[PDB]
Coordinates of C-alpha atoms in Angstrom, one line a residue:
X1 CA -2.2 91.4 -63.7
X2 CA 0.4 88.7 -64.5
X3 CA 1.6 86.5 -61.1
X4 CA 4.9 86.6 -59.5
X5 CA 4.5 86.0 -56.3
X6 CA 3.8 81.4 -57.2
X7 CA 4.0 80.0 -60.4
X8 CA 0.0 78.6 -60.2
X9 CA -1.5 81.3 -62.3
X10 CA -4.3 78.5 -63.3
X11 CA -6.1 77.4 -60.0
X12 CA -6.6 81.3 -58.8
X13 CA -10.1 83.5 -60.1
X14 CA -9.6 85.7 -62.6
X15 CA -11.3 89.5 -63.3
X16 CA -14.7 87.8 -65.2
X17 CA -15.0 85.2 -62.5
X18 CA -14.0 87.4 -59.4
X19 CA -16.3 90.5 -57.8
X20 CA -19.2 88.4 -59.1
X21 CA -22.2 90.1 -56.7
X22 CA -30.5 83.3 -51.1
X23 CA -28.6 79.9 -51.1
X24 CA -30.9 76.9 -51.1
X25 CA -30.3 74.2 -48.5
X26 CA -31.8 70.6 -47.9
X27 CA -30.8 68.6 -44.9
X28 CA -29.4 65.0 -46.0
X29 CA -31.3 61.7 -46.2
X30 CA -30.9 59.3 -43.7
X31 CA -27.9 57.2 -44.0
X32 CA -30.4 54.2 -43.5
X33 CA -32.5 55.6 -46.5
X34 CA -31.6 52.7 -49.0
X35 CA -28.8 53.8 -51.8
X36 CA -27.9 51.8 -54.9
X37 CA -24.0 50.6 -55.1
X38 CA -21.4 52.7 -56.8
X39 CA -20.9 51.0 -60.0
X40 CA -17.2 51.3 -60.6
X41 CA -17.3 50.4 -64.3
X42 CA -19.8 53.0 -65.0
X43 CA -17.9 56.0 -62.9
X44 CA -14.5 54.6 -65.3
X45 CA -16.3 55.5 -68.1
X46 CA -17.4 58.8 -66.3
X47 CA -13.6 59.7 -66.1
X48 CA -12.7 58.5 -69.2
X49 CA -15.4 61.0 -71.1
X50 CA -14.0 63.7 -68.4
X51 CA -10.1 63.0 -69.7
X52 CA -11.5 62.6 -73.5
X53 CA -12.7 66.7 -73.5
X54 CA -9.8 68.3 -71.8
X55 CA -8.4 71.2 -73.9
X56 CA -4.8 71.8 -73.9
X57 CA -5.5 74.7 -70.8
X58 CA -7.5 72.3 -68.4
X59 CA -4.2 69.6 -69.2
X60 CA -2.0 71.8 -67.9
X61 CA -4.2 72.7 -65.1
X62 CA -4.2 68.8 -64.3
X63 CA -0.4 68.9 -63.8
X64 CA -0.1 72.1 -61.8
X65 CA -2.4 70.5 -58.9
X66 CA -0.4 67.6 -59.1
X67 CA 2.4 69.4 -58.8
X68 CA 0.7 71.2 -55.4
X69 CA -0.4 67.8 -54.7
X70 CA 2.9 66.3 -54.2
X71 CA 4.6 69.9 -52.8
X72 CA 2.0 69.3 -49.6
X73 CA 2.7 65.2 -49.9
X74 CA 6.7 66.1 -48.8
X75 CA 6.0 69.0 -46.7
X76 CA 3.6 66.3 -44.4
X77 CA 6.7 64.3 -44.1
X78 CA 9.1 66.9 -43.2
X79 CA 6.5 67.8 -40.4
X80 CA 6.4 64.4 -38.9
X81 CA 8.9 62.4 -36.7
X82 CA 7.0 59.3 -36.5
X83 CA 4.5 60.4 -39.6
X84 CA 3.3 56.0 -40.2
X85 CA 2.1 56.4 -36.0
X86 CA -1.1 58.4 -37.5
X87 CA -1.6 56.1 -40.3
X88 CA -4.6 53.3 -39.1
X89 CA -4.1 50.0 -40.9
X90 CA -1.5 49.8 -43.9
X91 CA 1.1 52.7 -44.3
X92 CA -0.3 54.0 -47.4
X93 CA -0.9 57.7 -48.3
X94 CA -2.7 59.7 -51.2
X95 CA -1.2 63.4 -51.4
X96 CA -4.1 63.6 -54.6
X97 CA -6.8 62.9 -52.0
X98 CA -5.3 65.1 -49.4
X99 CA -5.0 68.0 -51.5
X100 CA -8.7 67.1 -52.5
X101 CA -9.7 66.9 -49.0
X102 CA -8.0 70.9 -48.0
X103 CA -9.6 71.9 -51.3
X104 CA -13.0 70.6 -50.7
X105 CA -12.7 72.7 -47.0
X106 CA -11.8 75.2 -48.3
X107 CA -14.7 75.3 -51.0
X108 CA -17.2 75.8 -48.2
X109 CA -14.7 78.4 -46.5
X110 CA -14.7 82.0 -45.8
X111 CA -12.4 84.7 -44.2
X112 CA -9.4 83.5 -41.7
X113 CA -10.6 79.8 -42.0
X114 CA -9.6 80.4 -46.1
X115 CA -6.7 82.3 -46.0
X116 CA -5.2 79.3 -43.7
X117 CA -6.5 76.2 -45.9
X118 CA -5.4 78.4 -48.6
X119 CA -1.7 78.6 -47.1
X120 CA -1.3 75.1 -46.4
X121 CA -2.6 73.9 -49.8
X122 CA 0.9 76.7 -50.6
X123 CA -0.3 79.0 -53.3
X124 CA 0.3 82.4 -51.7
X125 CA -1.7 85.9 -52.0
X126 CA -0.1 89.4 -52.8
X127 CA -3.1 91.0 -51.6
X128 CA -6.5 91.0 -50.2
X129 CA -7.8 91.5 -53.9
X130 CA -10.7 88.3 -54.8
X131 CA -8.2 87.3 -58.3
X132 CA -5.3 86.5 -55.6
X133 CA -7.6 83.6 -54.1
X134 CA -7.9 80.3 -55.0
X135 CA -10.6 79.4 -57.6
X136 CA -12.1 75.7 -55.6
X137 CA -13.7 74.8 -58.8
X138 CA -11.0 75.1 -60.8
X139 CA -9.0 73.1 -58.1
X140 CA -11.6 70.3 -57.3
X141 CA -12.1 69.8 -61.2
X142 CA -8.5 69.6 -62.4
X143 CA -8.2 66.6 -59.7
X144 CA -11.0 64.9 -61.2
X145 CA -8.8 65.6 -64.7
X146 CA -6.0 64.2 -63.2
X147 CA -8.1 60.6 -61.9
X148 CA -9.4 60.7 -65.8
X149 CA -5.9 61.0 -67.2
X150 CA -5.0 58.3 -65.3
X151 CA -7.6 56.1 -66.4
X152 CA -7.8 56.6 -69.6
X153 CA -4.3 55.1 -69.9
X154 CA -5.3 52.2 -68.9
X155 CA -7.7 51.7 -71.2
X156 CA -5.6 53.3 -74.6
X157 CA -3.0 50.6 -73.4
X158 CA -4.7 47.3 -74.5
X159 CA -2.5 45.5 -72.3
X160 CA -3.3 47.8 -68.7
X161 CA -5.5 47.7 -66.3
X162 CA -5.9 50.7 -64.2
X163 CA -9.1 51.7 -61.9
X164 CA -9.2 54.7 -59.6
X165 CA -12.6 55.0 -58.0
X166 CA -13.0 58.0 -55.1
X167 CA -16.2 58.6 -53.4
X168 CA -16.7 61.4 -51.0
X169 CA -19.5 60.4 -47.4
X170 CA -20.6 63.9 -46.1
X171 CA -22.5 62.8 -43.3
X172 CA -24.1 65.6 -40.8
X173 CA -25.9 65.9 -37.9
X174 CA -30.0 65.6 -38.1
X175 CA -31.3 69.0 -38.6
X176 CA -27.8 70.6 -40.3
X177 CA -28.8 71.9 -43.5
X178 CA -26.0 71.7 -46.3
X179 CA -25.9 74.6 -49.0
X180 CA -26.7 73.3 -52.8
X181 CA -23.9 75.3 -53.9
X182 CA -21.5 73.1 -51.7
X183 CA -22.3 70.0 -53.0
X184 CA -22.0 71.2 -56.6
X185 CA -18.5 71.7 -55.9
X186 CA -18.3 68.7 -54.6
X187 CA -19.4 67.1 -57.6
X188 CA -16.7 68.6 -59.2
X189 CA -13.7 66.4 -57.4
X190 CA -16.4 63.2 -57.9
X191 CA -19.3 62.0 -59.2
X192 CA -20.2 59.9 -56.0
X193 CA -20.7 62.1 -53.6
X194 CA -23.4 60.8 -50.6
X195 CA -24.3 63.4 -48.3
X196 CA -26.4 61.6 -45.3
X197 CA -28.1 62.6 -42.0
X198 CA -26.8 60.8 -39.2
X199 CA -27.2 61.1 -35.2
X200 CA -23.3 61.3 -33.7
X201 CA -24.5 61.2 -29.8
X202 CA -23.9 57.9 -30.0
X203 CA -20.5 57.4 -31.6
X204 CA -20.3 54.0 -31.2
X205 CA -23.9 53.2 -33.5
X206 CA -22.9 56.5 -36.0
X207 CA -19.4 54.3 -36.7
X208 CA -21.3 51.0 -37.4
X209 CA -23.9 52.8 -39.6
X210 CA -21.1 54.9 -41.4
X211 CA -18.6 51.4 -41.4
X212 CA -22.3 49.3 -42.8
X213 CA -23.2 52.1 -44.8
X214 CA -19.7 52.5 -46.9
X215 CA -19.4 48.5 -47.2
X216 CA -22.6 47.8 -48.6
X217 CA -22.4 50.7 -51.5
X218 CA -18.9 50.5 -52.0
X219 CA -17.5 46.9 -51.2
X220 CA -14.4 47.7 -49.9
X221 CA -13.6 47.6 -45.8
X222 CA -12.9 50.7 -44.3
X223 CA -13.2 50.2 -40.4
X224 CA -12.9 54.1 -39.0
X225 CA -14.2 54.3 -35.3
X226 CA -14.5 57.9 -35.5
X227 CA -11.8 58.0 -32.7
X228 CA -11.4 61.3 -32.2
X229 CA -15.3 62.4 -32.5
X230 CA -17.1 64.1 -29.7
X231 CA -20.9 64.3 -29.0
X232 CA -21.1 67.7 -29.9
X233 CA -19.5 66.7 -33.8
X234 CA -22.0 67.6 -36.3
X235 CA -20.0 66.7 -39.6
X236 CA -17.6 64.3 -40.8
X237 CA -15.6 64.3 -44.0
X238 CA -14.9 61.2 -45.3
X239 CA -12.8 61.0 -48.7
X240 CA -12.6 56.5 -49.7
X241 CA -10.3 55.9 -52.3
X242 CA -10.0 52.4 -54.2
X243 CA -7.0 51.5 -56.8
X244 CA -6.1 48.3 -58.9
X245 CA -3.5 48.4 -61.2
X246 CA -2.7 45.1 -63.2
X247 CA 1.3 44.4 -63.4
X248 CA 2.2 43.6 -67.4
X249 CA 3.8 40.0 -67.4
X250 CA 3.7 39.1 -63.8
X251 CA 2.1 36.1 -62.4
X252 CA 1.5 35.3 -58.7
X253 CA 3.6 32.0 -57.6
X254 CA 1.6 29.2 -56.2
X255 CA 4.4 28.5 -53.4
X256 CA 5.0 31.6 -51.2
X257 CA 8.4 33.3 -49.9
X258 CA 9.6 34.4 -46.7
X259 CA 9.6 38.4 -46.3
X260 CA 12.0 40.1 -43.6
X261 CA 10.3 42.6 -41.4
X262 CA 13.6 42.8 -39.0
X263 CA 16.8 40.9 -39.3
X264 CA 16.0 38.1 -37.2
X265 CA 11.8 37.9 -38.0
X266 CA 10.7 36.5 -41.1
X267 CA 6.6 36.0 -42.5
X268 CA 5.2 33.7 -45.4
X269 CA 4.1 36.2 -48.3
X270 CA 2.2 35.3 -51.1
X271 CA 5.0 36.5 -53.6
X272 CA 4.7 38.5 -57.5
X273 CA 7.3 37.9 -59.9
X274 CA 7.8 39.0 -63.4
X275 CA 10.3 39.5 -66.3
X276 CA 11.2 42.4 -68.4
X277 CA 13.1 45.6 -69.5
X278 CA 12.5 47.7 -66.2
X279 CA 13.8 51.2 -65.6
X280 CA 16.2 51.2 -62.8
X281 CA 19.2 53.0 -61.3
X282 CA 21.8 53.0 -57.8
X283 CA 22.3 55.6 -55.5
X284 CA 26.0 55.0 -54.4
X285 CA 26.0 57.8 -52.5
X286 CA 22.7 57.8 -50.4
X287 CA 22.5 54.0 -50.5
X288 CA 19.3 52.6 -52.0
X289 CA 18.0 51.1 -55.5
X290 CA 14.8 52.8 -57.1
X291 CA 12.7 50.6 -59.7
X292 CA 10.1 51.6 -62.1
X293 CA 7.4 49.4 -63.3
X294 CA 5.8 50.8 -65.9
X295 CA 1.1 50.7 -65.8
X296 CA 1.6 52.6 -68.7
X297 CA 3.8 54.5 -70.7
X298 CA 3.6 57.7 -68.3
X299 CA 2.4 55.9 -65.1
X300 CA 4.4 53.5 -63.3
X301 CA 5.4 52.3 -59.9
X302 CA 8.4 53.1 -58.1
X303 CA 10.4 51.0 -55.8
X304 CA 12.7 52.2 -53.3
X305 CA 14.4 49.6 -51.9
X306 CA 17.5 50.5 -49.7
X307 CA 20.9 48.8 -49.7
X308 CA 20.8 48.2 -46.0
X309 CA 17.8 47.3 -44.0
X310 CA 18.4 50.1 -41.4
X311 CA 18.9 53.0 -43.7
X312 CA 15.2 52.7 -44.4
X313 CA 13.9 56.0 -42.3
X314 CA 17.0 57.7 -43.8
X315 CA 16.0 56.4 -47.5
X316 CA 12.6 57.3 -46.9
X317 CA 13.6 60.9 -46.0
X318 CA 15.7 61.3 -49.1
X319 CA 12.7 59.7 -51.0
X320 CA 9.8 62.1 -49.7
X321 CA 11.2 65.6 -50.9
X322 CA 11.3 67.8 -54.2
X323 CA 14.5 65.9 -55.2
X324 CA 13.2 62.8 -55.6
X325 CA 10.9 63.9 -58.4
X326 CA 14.9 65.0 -60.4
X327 CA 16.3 61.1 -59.9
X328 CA 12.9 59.9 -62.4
X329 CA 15.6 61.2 -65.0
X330 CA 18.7 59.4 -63.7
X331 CA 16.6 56.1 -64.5
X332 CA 18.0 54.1 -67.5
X333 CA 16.8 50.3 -68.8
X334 CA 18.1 46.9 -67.3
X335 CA 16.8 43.6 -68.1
X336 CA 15.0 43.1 -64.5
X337 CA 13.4 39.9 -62.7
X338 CA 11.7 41.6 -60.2
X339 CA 10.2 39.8 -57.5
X340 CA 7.6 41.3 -54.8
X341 CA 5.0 40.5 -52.9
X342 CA 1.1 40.9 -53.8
X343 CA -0.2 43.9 -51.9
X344 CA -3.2 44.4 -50.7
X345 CA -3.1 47.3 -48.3
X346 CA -6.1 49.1 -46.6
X347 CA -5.2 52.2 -44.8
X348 CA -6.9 55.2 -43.2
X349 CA -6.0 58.2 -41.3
X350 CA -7.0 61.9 -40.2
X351 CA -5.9 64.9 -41.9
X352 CA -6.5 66.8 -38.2
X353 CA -3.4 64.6 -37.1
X354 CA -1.4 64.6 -40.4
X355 CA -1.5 68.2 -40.3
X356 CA -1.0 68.7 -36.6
X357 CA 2.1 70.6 -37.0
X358 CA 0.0 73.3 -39.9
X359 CA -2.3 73.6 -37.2
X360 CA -5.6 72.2 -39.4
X361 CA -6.7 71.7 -35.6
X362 CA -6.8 75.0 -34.7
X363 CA -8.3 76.1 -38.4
X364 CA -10.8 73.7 -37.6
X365 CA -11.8 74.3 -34.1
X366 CA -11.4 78.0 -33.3
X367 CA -12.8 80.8 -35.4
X368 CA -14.4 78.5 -37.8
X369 CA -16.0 80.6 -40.8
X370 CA -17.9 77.5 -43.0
X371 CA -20.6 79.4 -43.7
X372 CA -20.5 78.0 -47.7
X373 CA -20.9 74.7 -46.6
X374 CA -23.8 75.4 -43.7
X375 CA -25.0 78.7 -41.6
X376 CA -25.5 75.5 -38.5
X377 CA -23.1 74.8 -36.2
X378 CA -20.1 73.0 -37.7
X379 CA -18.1 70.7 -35.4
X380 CA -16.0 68.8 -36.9
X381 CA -16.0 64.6 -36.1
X382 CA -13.6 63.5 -38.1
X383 CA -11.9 64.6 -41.8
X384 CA -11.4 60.7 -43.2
X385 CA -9.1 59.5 -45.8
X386 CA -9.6 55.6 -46.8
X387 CA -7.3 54.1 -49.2
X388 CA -7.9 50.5 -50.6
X389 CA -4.5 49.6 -52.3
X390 CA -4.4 46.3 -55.1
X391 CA -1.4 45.1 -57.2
X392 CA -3.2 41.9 -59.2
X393 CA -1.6 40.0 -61.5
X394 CA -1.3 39.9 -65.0
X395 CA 23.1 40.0 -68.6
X396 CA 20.2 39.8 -66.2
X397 CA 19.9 41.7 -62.4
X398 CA 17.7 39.7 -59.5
X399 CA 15.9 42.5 -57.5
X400 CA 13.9 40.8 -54.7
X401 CA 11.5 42.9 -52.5
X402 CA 11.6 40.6 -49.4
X403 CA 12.6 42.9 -46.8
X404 CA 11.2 46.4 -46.3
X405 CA 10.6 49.0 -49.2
X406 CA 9.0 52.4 -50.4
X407 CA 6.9 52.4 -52.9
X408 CA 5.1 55.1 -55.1
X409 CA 2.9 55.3 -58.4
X410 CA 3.3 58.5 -60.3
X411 CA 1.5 59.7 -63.7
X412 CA 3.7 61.9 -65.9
X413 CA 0.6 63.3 -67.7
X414 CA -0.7 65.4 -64.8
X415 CA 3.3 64.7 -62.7
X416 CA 1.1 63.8 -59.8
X417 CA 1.6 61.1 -57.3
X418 CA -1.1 59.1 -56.9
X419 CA 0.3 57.2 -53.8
X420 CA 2.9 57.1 -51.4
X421 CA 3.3 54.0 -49.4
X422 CA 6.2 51.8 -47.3
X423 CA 5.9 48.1 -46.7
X424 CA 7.1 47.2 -43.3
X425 CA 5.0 43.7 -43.6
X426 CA 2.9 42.9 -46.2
X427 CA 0.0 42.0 -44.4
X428 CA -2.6 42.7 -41.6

């Protein structure tokens, strides 16, 4: 039958797909077992040839996960007081990769454990009927659509430069063996995905070899302790996420500026500064400024910068809700000289503490059904999300970004965002 009960017809099973009625399994090579380097050029034009073969069906797919995407982004925010004390490193979050993270869970989920990752990724069932339930494929595939839509506007526009690379470390216990279904799901959400063996009795080693591992096949610096691991932790779920997105007409100035992180404090920031027609628009009301910097013609960056330096956890809680998606229309040209500094943020946190308040914990720990993803004993380490963040370079109103500001990059194609970030200080 037709759905009433959410509007997200498209990610759920339908009648040929559903009541569909002796898994194969392989246990993980070593981490230390030698892997070639992602090459990042070749996985862009991986997601390009993904973006360049979506019908008009799996489009609209794209945008209704990163709709869902951004639903969970603002109700993680709502459920925090102090959300940036989680955050490890730069205060930069990906509500695409979160989603992508509770989706790839719940692929390898079964029973209670389902139903709960199925309520917090907040696409309800009527019933206990198999076409009510999510469809993971359809989910972990129409994020992949949504990475490809991005990308491929990069490349269209001859004067962009966006890159998106996400890679996905399943690494297990010795002995755990991991269900070949599982990791075709995986696949799905990524091409690199790197299941590997590792020994977690010694926590301290298993970090260095994950940390050593990750560096040498990626490049980028990711520096998770597994601080909340145990000895008895047989998996951990790492999601790594890089972006670079080149900023059309800015240049980086030689001579740096000095950025206010409190009213009396100021720091030496290597500064970006560029001239053009910019979307833009003041909140009398709520007090704050909003920027847009266009990547593309339907991705760009926002900037939330309020009128008054301690009105920023009040701006940022007018900024991370449903509302803030309407103001995109209340947006209208100025001739802008926006200057802000180069960022170059890495971040990382745990979903088990960003969803505290969802109780993931609890999902996670008690009554755990996993049984898709392994018939072993699943205790869960740690459930990772890495973010490597890079703006490079490339009558009138002076917007300066050198105090604190919010910051986000959203794609109109799939309405997803990509990013949500705040700059206290612009380096670490």
């Amino acid at each position: 039958d037709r759905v009433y009960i959410h509007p997200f017809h498209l990610v759920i099973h339908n009648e040929s797909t559903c009541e569909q009625l002796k898994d194969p399994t392989f246990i993980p090579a070593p981490i230390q077992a030698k892997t070639s380097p992602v090459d990042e050029k070749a996985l862009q034009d991986q997601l390009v040839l993904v973006a360049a073969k979506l019908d008009t069906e799996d489009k609209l797919r794209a945008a209704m996960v990163g709709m869902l995407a951004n639903f969970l982004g603002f109700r993680i925010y709502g459920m925090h007081s102090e959300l940036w004390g989680v955050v490890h490193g730069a205060t930069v979050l990906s509500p695409t990769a979160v989603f992508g993270t509770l989706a790839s869970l719940y692929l390898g989920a079964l029973d209670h454990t389902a139903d709960r990752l199925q309520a917090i990724l907040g696409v309800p069932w009527k019933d206990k009927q198999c076409t009510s339930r999510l469809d993971a494929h359809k989910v972990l595939s129409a994020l992949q659509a949504v990475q490809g839509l991005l990308v491929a506007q990069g490349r269209a526009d001859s004067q962009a430069q966006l890159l998106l690379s996400t890679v996905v470390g399943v690494f297990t216990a010795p002995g755990l063996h991991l269900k070949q279904p599982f990791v075709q799901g995986l696949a799905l959400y990524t091409p690199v995905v790197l299941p590997r063996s590792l020994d977690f009795t010694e926590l301290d080693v298993a970090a260095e070899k994950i940390d050593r591992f990750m560096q040498a096949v990626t490049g980028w610096k990711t520096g998770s302790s597994l601080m909340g691991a145990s000895v008895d932790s047989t998996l951990a779920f790492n999601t790594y996420v890089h972006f670079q997105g080149k900023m059309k007409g800015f240049s980086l100035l030689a001579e740096p500026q000095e950025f206010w992180v409190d009213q009396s404090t100021s720091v030496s920031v290597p500064m970006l500064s560029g001239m053009g027609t910019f979307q833009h628009w003041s909140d009398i009301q709520d007090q704050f400024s909003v920027t847009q910097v266009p990547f593309t013609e339907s991705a760009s960056l926002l900037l939330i910068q309020p009128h008054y330096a301690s009105d920023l956890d009040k701006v940022e809680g007018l900024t991370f809700q449903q509302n803030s998606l309407n103001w995109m229309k209340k947006l209208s040209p100025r001739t802008i000289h926006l200057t802000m500094p180069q960022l170059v943020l890495q971040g990382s946190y745990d979903l088990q503490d960003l969803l505290a308040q969802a109780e993931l914990p609890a999902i996670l720990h008690t009554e755990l059904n996993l049984q898709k993803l392994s018939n072993d004993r699943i205790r869960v380490g740690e459930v990772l999300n890495s973010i490597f963040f890079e703006l490079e370079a490339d009558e009138v109103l002076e917007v300066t970004l050198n105090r604190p500001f919010l910051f986000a990059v959203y794609d109109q194609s799939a309405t997803a965002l990509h990013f949500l970030g705040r700059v206290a200080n612009p380096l670490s």
